[model samples]
Target: AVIGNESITINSPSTNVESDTKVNVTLAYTANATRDIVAEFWSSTGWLGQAVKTVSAGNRTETLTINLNNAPATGSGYVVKASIRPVGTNWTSNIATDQVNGLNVIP
Candidate 1:
């Protein structure tokens, strides 16, 4: 599996997100082979943003960063879903997801 232990993580900040600002969401996972990683950020209202990058093999642990900016809502219940697939291939079975609760958005 491209993801380590078939699992993934959503590393978010402890404080609330301010509107029109940029915050980093770090995804931690393990990749067995060289692949493509896509991390998507979402809120209850709608999609916020996404980050994509390439992962190289021979590394056990890896991290990808996503930027969350100008969130559309001002409440909680946000999620980060990430998936890894073969280069130039569509979505496959390699994926992992995590949630960030009480992540309020504010202006």
Candidate 2:
């Protein structure tokens, strides 16, 4: 992962998932930094689930993971709100819009 100045991106997790999926939260800055990444899922009732990952540095890019279990129901559709932030050392935060697949949990 790489970042310019300060940045955030939803790079992976295959863009879609079920009850189980790898959530990749990537962020970047010019130097060593601490970043927090998050993935939020929506259920039939409303937004009700989330996961998070954290990292320090790389290529100036930072990456982490998140887990969302039972976030949404089967056959229902919702957008996964992914986000990242360069924190603890001064940087801006960002967000991304993405989707999840099925739940085998991968179902």
Candidate 3:
């Protein structure tokens, strides 16, 4: 599982998202030999945004930033999911997805 092999993390996440407050989700992963990254954000209002970035080769960590502005509340309210998989000729989709969910108390 990517959750076990690769290290994924969210910096200072909020359980309850509030409007007018800055919601910047920093999605990061650490490992080597991976390609294609997916970082997505959504609210009760539906899909908010997504981030797709290229992962450089080498034993380096990769990151993506998703912006949250005027976000509405939904199911827990807000959600963030991210994952990375290998690419090229010999590739596998063994990477597991990681996510953080919370509801927004904004009315």
Candidate 4:
């Protein structure tokens, strides 16, 4: 089975975050082949930070930790994006992609 046809989900975290804090984002997916899973943080302007892990085929749950220090400013509308990248492939060829929104950065 090819990895490309699989699916993923980004489990949303607590809605509120303090500046310079760390939050854990969870991803759930079924891997049909070995792949690297990536989780990334994003504010309205651009990308913040990301976490990645390589795993073999199976039903898996992974954690991605994002430090709010990467946040450029305090505000709302932050989001997390999770993707499954097949080994030796790039973002454009990712197997799956998922995102969850609604995080606020507080002082």
Worst 10 residues of 3 by lDDT: 87-96
> Model 1: per-residue lDDT, tens digit, 54-97?
77754444455556554456767765566766656655555555
lDDT of 1: 0.60
Candidate 3 per-residue lDDT over residues 62-93, each given as its tens digit:
55656656545433657767766665322247
List candidate 4 segments past 4 Å from native: 1-4, 67-72
Model 2 worst lDDT window (10 residues)? 96-105
Tens digits of per-residue lDDT for model 2, 1-107: 54455444444444445454444444433323566555665544566566655655543544555555533345544445555554432223453233454312234
TM-score versus the correct structure, for each prediction: 0.63, 0.49, 0.58, 0.79
Which pairs of residues collide in candidate 2?
16-100, 16-101, 17-100, 17-101, 18-102, 20-105, 58-61, 103-106, 103-107, 104-107
Best candidate (score: lDDT): 4
Kindly provide the TM-score of model 3 when superposed on the true structure, using C-alpha atoms: 0.58
Global CA lDDT of candidate 3, please? Answer: 0.59
TM-score winner between candidates 3 and 4: 4
**Against the unseen true structure, what C-alpha lDDT does each candidate score?**
0.60, 0.48, 0.59, 0.78
Candidate 2 positional error at 19, Å: 3.8
Query: Cα lDDT of model 2 overall?
Result: 0.48
RMSD (Cα, Å) for all candidates, in order, is: 3.9, 5.7, 5.4, 2.8
RMSD of 1: 3.9
> What TM-score does structure 2 among the candidates reach?
0.49
- Residue-level lDDT of model 4, residues 52-104, one tens digit each, is 88878888788877665653468888887889888767699887898877788
